[model samples]
Target: MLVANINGGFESTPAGVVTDLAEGVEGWDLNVGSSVTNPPVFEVLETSDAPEGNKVLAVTVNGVGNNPFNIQATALPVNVRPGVTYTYTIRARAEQDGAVVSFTVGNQSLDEYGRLHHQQITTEWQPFTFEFTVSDQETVIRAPIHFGYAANVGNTIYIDGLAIVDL
Candidate 1:
């Protein structure tokens, strides 16, 4: 039963709220190359009348002249039920096709042991949700929701309003 009340700026949002998890969450880096002119940016936007209740998480990354890299937020305690599907929601935009955005959950080994588990974003500002099932016991739920950009030069992308839920 994980309930995260995400509000205000991206920095203020809660991370690693699950039980038996580390105090601080870890973020992964894409590290495309020196061509990365600008680092990723995050902002909070108010969309409704409720000032603190309605906010957006906006991320903008420089995809030009370099391979796209991503900064991701991850949690701990990889204990997802096998064969059960999980969903993650987000609002995103990209300047090109196949921006390679993804939300990943797994163990430290699966995430770091050369396992290429991720999804892609093909549309703009449209709300999108990705669904995946834990296929094996090796899956570690104590991982970060990964956001990745493909190996293309001169590309840029943005994302906001991210949420992970069990359906």
Candidate 2:
């Protein structure tokens, strides 16, 4: 089973986040550009690149501007309370420095242009966070989480320990 102890920061009480939000990611929904001839390779790694022992998500692109992507959606729609501050934390790094990419996922559009994420990633295996709040009570699913280079280039990006916390 998936297990985690999420520490909270929105004081006044113990608000530890519920773990296994991503328990359904046995394999994420592979989203990619229709024109993408060489899609990215998504796999688990068991090496030093992983933040934890033998655990990491590796995304490798084979061609330029493929817009390689993936998103792990719960089997059922997830209930997101309105105005609840939510944040996503990920341990990530790029094979090449400044491989233009985004981090985190949200209960929003399936389109890359509409979903929410951390706009740029410049560090290697360091923690990156993106936060937002829902406007109204809504059922949501994670989709359209993307990681890729800007244009005319393809490289690998190491992502590990994805988390969505109740902030």
Candidate 3:
């Protein structure tokens, strides 16, 4: 069983709308694009439909755009041991069917971790998991969710109950 506190839950975040997640939300970082003007909107809301807690994160994409939009847990990156496989899981759903997203665990290097790519989001909540093992040189990792590359425009993706476990 899990004992220590993890960084996946969003219960501590206030429930409200926020366009700038980095300024508003603690322990998380959001990136929309490099030079693109329009970006997706983010909000934390209270809902009974949350997978674990009463709060969930909602990200609404404005466009597929020139760059990929993503979010990462920068403040509390997960610690992993070498050669041990870990599974990262999150409960997610989109307002429209067939929205695509990717999951991975890595630092700024981006080349270090494996990815569960092109996961098609359904209209209802579903659990998605990405399994990966850190290299001998790597000990710390961050959970980053990518929301581009054929993602549906004007649709909101609801996310909650994120976790990581060794397997």
Which predicted model would earn the best TM-score?
Answer: 3
Evaluated at residue 113, the lDDT of candidate 3 is: 71
Find the number of clashing residue pairs for candidate 3.
0
The local distance difference test score of each candidate is 0.44, 0.48, 0.70
lDDT of candidate 1 over 1-167, digit per residue (tens): 34121321234434322222223212222222345455444334444522223544434454434222344444444345656666656565656776665554555565432122445555456666666566666534543444435332344444455444566
Instruction: For candidate 3, write residues 1-167 as lDDT tens digits.
Output: 45112546678888888666565665567667644445677788899988878898888777566645433323245666777777778888988876877776675566547777778889899999877777666666666777755456778888887777887
Error of 3 at 53 (Å): 0.3
The TM-score of candidate 1 is 0.49
- As for TM-score, the candidate ahead, 1 or 2, is 2
Q: Candidate 1 has which clashing residue pairs, if any?
A: 63-155, 65-154, 74-144, 76-142, 78-141, 78-142, 106-140, 107-140
TM-score, predicted candidate 3 vs. hidden true structure: 0.85
**TM-score-superior candidate, 1 or 3:** 3
**TM-score for predicted model 2 compared with the true structure:** 0.65
